[PDB]
């Protein structure tokens, strides 16, 4: 994993949000979290081959902090529909 992505993961807040891994400007995986810190730190010790792949292929990580868990649910669904990222199921 790129050093700048590891750093961004370790700085993420204990707040609800949506995250987007990208390569060459294109989203490759979109997810949501009750706490961005907890969900993103799981990428450092991969429990599945898919989590390993996403973290090695990415050249960028964007995070979006939201108002609450209701907003996280709808924003994540809308962005998956818009971008159809390679690692999200269809
Ligand atoms: Mn690494
Ligand atoms: Mn999801
Ligand atoms: Mn497995
Ligand atoms: Mn980055
Ligand atoms: Mn960007």
Swiss-Prot record:
It is found in: Cytoplasm. Residues 14-89 form the GIY-YIG domain. Interacts with UvrB in an incision complex. Belongs to the UvrC family. The UvrABC repair system catalyzes the recognition and processing of DNA lesions. UvrC both incises the 5' and 3' sides of the lesion. The N-terminal half is responsible for the 3' incision and the C-terminal half is responsible for the 5' incision. This is UvrABC system protein C. It comes from Thermotoga maritima (strain ATCC 43589 / DSM 3109 / JCM 10099 / NBRC 100826 / MSB8).
